[PDB]
Scaffold this active site. Structure first.
Site, PDB file in Angstrom:
ATOM      1  N   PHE A   1       0.893  -1.131   0.000  1.00 47.10           N
ATOM      2  CA  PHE A   1       0.000   0.000   0.000  1.00 47.10           C
ATOM      3  C   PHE A   1       0.950   1.204   0.000  1.00 47.10           C
ATOM      4  CE2 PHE A   1      -4.271  -1.812   1.056  1.00 47.10           C
ATOM      5  CZ  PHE A   1      -3.864  -3.089   1.378  1.00 47.10           C
ATOM      6  N   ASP A   2       1.587   1.439  -1.122  1.00 47.40           N
ATOM      7  CA  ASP A   2       2.615   2.411  -1.255  1.00 47.40           C
ATOM      8  C   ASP A   2       2.341   3.773  -0.672  1.00 47.40           C
ATOM      9  OD1 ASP A   2       3.617   0.373  -2.953  1.00 47.40           O
ATOM     10  OD2 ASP A   2       4.239   1.716  -4.521  1.00 47.40           O
TER      11      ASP A   2
ATOM     12  N   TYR B   1       9.923  -0.513  -8.160  1.00 45.77           N
ATOM     13  CA  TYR B   1       8.865   0.085  -8.899  1.00 45.77           C
ATOM     14  C   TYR B   1       8.998   1.584  -9.225  1.00 45.77           C
ATOM     15  N   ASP B   2       8.998   1.989 -10.498  1.00 46.13           N
ATOM     16  CA  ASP B   2       8.933   3.418 -10.864  1.00 46.13           C
ATOM     17  C   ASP B   2       7.548   3.755 -11.462  1.00 46.13           C
ATOM     18  OD1 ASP B   2      11.721   2.274 -11.102  1.00 46.13           O
ATOM     19  OD2 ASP B   2      12.234   4.388 -11.328  1.00 46.13           O
ATOM     20  N   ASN B   3       6.929   4.869 -11.102  1.00 49.50           N
ATOM     21  CA  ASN B   3       5.606   5.247 -11.472  1.00 49.50           C
ATOM     22  C   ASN B   3       5.723   6.664 -12.056  1.00 49.50           C
ATOM     23  OD1 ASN B   3       3.658   3.163  -9.979  1.00 49.50           O
ATOM     24  ND2 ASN B   3       5.234   3.747  -8.528  1.00 49.50           N
TER      25      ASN B   3
ATOM     26  N   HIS C   1      -1.316  -4.150 -10.030  1.00 53.76           N
ATOM     27  CA  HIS C   1      -1.055  -2.777  -9.653  1.00 53.76           C
ATOM     28  C   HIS C   1      -2.383  -2.036  -9.686  1.00 53.76           C
ATOM     29  CE1 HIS C   1       3.495  -2.927 -10.646  1.00 53.76           C
ATOM     30  NE2 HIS C   1       2.972  -3.927 -11.349  1.00 53.76           N
TER      31      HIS C   1
HETATM   32 CU   LIG Z   1       4.335  -5.169 -12.316  1.00 57.42          CU
END
Ligand SMILES: [Cu+2]
Ligand SMILES: *[C@H]1O[C@H](CO)[C@@H](O[C@H]2O[C@H](CO)[C@@H](O)[C@H](O)[C@H]2NC(C)=O)[C@H](O)[C@H]1NC(C)=O
Ligand SMILES: *[C@H]1O[C@H](CO)[C@@H](O[C@H]2O[C@H](CO)[C@@H](O)[C@H](O)[C@H]2NC(C)=O)[C@H](O)[C@H]1NC(C)=O
Ligand SMILES: *[C@@H]1O[C@H](CO)[C@@H](O)[C@H](O)[C@H]1NC(C)=O
Ligand SMILES: *[C@@H]1O[C@H](CO)[C@@H](O)[C@H](O)[C@H]1NC(C)=O
Ligand SMILES: [Cu+2]
Ligand SMILES: [Mn+2]
Ligand SMILES: [Mn+2]
Lengths: 642, 642
Positions: free
Chosen positions: A294-295, A382-384, A439
């Protein structure tokens, strides 16, 4: 601050440190700041202010979540009078956003734990090349309420790509309050994936390279079309405020568009931001069952925002905005280039070639300049890439792109031939399983379409079968519009049947009598694949509908609850809506869940090609007619030359 | 012609005219060319030529559809020997694509027609400002088999925007073979919408204009990165051929990608194009029940392709390709700038910021240059922007955007208040109804994944419930892949449940043993809203599935049949697949249906802001690892200066 909605300045971070340390001296107390952010002003005061700044005064109030001597305190501060105004102990379930500081201590624990050191040796691994990482662990039915985390370890020898060289087979549980490994089990010996071909820095790579990409140069003879005044943007026919919060990351507020025809600025969005993420893995084994991040809530989107690389994460003409985050001790950290703003060129705005008039050649084609507000959030591997795009046509287009590194599970399998059973993922390289996961992002959209009294309309497309032989046609479709009366009505699962989802102001109509409105054009929907009673799905229950509409409430802000680490799903959007409020012609808010099911493939290794997604907020009978009917294309200036 | 698949040149059109004119002298014959295109070479000969151009000879063969003394002939010419090798009369239902020429005479008919001149005067309209259009009429069960069309007329006085000023309430049917009005009914008197605010030419508009859009200038120090040699394109790691047909418009073929790692060019797509359109209206009345255009089949996509406006339809750096179409007498017509190719900049290719290594700061962001191949087709009031996007990462993204003018139905209603029954559309302006309708496109995609022997796999995502307490989790999801055995197995309704759809070469595996494949990442799907037995639905039955896969057949090419005007639905993709052939490990082809349900809004009027849609064909275990791992961002060069 210039504006009541401005992000906390350095100076403000410091006052807060001082005021709190004045009540909890550090020589006498264990003090850690887990969240320092703005306490939301009352909407009407903000609305009043905007029309009369010079004569509206809002005191800057800060909400602090601190763990002090092992107890979670909620502290409200009024910086106008420099004073704590409230100080309470959080007694329910869940803890705050982890801090960076504590995680940096926690990942050293294994390197000095004797049983781990034996484990590594038994495996023949160089202890000097191990890097570990902390993973939240959520909740699984147990009664214990402690700040534990799992620590995963990785080899780093010749590669900085550590997430692709996992040491798999060992359970390590650490308590962040004691800062101690409290549980350990070396369960399995698995090969460590090679380091060959896992490097992504050009500085570390060698030939050959390709294909070659031709370069470019460009220039705006009149400079950018946007003006940023403090955190206020002026661009084309739009005005909006750019905000920043250590939990939420980027916050867009007060977005209004000037109606050339009506000669008026009209409100569209009071506030929008991503309120929560949810990244559930699908390996039910001891190695990964607990991994369901839960980033925003566990790690903070603002705290995880990275600095944008000019000319790469943003095009060469972009303007950047630095923000401030804080450390565990409340010190202000400058985050350079946290947000960029840039104009995008070359899209057709509208066009027509008319060949239908004899002896006449009519053609018209016009282009548009669009505005992108970009920020990037990296939470571990993870990059968003988070984008807010604004168009002169009145359209708002929020998108998300995914890049970064697969979470690998190490294995002795080098060929798909050897798989005997469900690996819970795909073999993307010798010894490496890319585990299946999802995601999910939940956007908070406080639309105030031309003001705050609004309603939510669902227009269904229905097929009509002509029974009476009154047409040569056997069938046609038509529309049926229902207004959602209560929260229970506004819980939409996209894909059940065709429908348009519109937010209207029922009180304002066009000259022809249509209600002004904005419609959601979503991307193909993803739905949850976990049972509703599984623990992570309960805690992430806000993913249970693609769209939700709620009555506005200043305190409903975080979809997975105010306290998310170790939460029990007692405080989510799913729970608030059980009150089932009326949402007809009121201040209302929309929530849209975007999601992707990720089946890893070899092309995702060792780093992943961008994968992107997007929805559109499109004006629907908001304007009297095409709003860009009178907009001219940017001119084309010829290249100066050398 | 440099290559067997090139479009017909001017000289080829002339040889065809001459050759047909020698067997059917126009002194004695009524001769009209309805279609002149390339008869498809055999794939094997094309594949062989590819590897030994200089040692393989393919004769240019041409397929002609001509109406001669009212009979439809199918003529095949072999230009090598310069002679007709076949000539057959078509005796089934349906007719060829209308010609431009016949439509230009049909539209003059109402103006000399007494009953019509009277209708006009009863309405007080100025006959010297009337314009008419021909609309196809399809088939509704009737026995007749004639070339009739409906004629609709519009006022044009002060605006060139005729589609929004309909003269509504008059049935007019004309026979194109006799060329006369065969039926007439003045059913209704309705106001003609005003001309005020309908104009879209900047040359005809006046102030005010806005918002202002800032200019740009740009430059490629080393020029474009694509090399176009004839109709052959070389760009980055791609090679492909650009073709053009008077029916299909643009045709992409022989798309191969260089694999830097394998040191080999690998085949992806033998041929792709849009095979048919379907634009059904949803007004069961006499005014509109029959309007369900089949634009490629009834009007010709290549014949409706417009000349691109430079710097508007294509950015300033674009390169243009001209083509040739044919008139009804077979004369070659030059279509300037029918196709443009340009490079697009500014997208992130992949990136990662590494904050997990103590005392180390790692960050990498690289950008991609993409190739866009664009063409625009305007069929009446509709504009279709058609793009094929290629990426160095091996993704192809075909997209469609819509703009142009709404089909208005005239009404005496000026306000929504007055509405008392379903008007089958929305009031978008006083007296103007935008009628509901759909837009469906059917792509033909002859995938040859690293060769011709391919299979189609459906990977569905299954929820697995843990019962046996062997885990803390109550559930997880996994994948189940099935290979489609026969055509009945490959008919797919997207949205019933999650699944990845992949085309693989079951004979070529990556080093870890995965089958090389490409998968289709679709946009949110539209489904048909007409009954399956409704006439337009039968005729357009190819839109009954979002995805279909068929055994390759050189003659299965047009999804709504070879003859579409007045067709009865006896030669569509839906009928062919009744053969239910095998599709496991052979030359297969995928058909993908893309649609939009259009509920008009006042922003769509008087001209409509672009509305876009897109899908992606993504490598899936095609490459050993990320194919752009060793690709460098383009150099940012600084602007010289004035
Ligand atoms: Cu993924
Ligand atoms: C692995 O651990 C250490 C740390 O990586 C290795 O040595 C580094 O030590 C030198 C001094 O800094 C460098 O100049 C060497 O190039 C580098 N050595 C290695 C291995 O990369 C050490 O030799 C290794 N230990 C084992 C058990 O092999
Ligand atoms: C509308 O039809 C005709 C054709 O347009 C009108 O006359 C026009 O021709 C004049 C002389 O050549 C021009 O000076 C005018 O600008 C032009 N008018 C238009 C509308 O383009 C005529 O006025 C009509 N008459 C009636 C009785 O309806
Ligand atoms: C805010 O608090 C609760 C919890 O979010 C919410 O359901 C309620 O309706 C709101 N109360 C007020 C004072 O609006
Ligand atoms: C091609 O023609 C028909 C019609 O498309 C098709 O069904 C048949 O199987 C094919 N014939 C050959 C020669 O392959
Ligand atoms: Cu439309
Ligand atoms: Mn609201
Ligand atoms: Mn094939």
């Amino acid at each position: 601050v210039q504006h009541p909605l401005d992000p906390l300045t350095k100076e403000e971070f410091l006052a807060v440190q001082t005021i709190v340390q004045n009540k909890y001296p550090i020589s006498n107390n264990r003090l850690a700041f887990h969240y320092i952010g703005l306490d939301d002003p009352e909407k009407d005061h903000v609305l009043r202010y905007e029309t009369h700044p010079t004569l509206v005064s809002i005191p800057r109030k800060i909400f602090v979540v601190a763990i002090i001597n092992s107890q979670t305190h909620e502290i409200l501060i009024n910086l106008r009078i420099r004073s704590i105004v409230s100080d309470n102990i959080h007694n329910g379930y869940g803890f705050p956003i982890l801090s960076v500081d504590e995680q940096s201590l926690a990942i050293k624990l294994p390197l000095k734990y004797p049983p781990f050191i034996d484990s590594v040796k038994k495996r023949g691994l160089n202890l000097s090349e191990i890097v570990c990482s902390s993973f939240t662990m959520g909740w699984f039915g147990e009664e214990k309420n402690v700040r534990t985390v799992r620590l995963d370890c990785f080899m780093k020898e010749s590669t900085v790509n550590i997430y692709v060289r996992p040491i798999t087979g060992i359970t390590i549980v650490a308590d962040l309050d004691l800062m101690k490994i409290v549980e350990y089990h070396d369960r399995d010996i698995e090969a460590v994936p090679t380091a060959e071909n896992t490097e992504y820095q050009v500085s570390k790579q060698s030939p050959p390279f390709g294909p070659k990409q031709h370069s470019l140069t460009s220039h705006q003879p009149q400079g950018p079309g946007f003006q940023i005044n403090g955190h206020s943007v002026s661009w084309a026919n739009w005005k909006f405020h750019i905000g920043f919060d250590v939990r939420a990351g980027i916050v867009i507020s007060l977005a209004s568009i000037y109606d050339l025809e009506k000669h008026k600025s009209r409100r569209v969005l009071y506030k929008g931001y991503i309120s929560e993420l949810f990244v559930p893995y699908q390996d039910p084994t001891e190695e990964f069952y607990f991994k369901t991040f839960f980033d925003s809530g566990e790690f903070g989107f603002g705290l995880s925002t990275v600095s944008l690389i000019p000319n790469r994460d943003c095009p060469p003409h972009a303007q950047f905005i630095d923000t401030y985050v804080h450390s565990a001790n409340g010190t202000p950290i400058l985050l350079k280039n946290a947000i960029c703003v840039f104009e995008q060129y070359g899209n057709i705005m509208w066009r027509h070639t008319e060949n239908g008039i004899p002896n006449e050649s009519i053609e018209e084609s016009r282009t548009e300049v669009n505005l992108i507000v970009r920020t990037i959030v990296t939470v571990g591997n993870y990059d968003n890439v988070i984008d807010w795009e604004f168009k002169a046509s009145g359209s708002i287009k929020p998108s998300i792109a995914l890049s970064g590194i697969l979470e690998i599970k190490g294995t002795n399998i080098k060929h798909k031939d050897e798989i005997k059973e469900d690996l819970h993922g795909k073999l993307v390289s010798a010894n490496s399983i890319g585990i299946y996961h999802d995601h999910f992002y939940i956007y908070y959209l406080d639309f105030d379409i031309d003001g705050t009294h609004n309603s939510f309309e669902k227009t269904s497309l229905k097929t009509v079968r002509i029974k009476d032989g009154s047409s040569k046609r056997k069938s046609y479709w038509t529309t049926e519009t229902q207004t959602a009366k209560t929260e229970s009505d506004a819980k939409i699962t996209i894909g059940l049947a065709p429908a348009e989802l519109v937010v209207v102001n029922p009180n304002i109509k066009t000259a022809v009598g249509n209600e002004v409105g904005y419609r959601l054009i979503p991307a193909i929907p993803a739905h949850p694949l976990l049972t509703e009673d599984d623990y992570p799905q309960i805690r992430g229950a806000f993913t249970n509908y693609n769209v939700w509409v709620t009555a506005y409430n200043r305190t409903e802000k975080w979809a997975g609850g105010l306290y998310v680490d170790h939460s029990r799903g007692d405080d989510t959007l799913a729970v608030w809506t059980k009150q089932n409020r009326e949402i007809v012609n009121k201040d209302i808010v929309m929530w849209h869940v975007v999601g992707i099911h990720h089946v890893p493939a070899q092309e995702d290794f060792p780093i992943m090609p961008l994968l992107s997604t997007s929805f559109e907020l499109r004006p629907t009978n908001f304007f009297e007619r095409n709003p860009v009917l009178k907009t001219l294309s940017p001119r084309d200036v010829a290249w100066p030359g050398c």
